[PDB]
Amino acid sequence: MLKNGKTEDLGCMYKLFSRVPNGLKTMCECMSSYLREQGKALVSEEGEGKNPVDYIQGLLDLKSRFDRFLLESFNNDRLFKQTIAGDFEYFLNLN
Known part of the structure; x- marks a missing residue:
């Protein structure tokens, strides 16, 4: 769904993973993987x-x-925005 662009499914799985602790961190790590890969x-x-x-x-x-x-x-969660901004920094310091 990250490459599909379906935001509805991403939102549903976000709202399901918000309750469990650090499930949002699982999604944040997946975001970090995707963004770091594409930016690199x-x-x-x-x-x-x-x-x-x-x-x-x-x-x-x-x-x-x-x-x-x-x-x-x-x-607009703090963890997700922080992770994407971090990836921004990592592969923008090289630009």
Whole structure:
């Protein structure tokens, strides 16, 4: 559902995992995995040059893309927004 873009299902599973302690942390770790993977792929220049849409400024767009998951599906929660902002920092310090 993170690659599907279905925010309804992400919200339902967020509301189910909120009650259990650190189930939200399970989702936050999955978010960290997804965002770190995609950002590391983007920052790592591929081929003979990377277009701005992917590397130079595609990183900001991807940060907004995962912000979409944060707001719509993860309630703007402190843990999820913190994790995505951390991934932002990690693979933006290289940009």
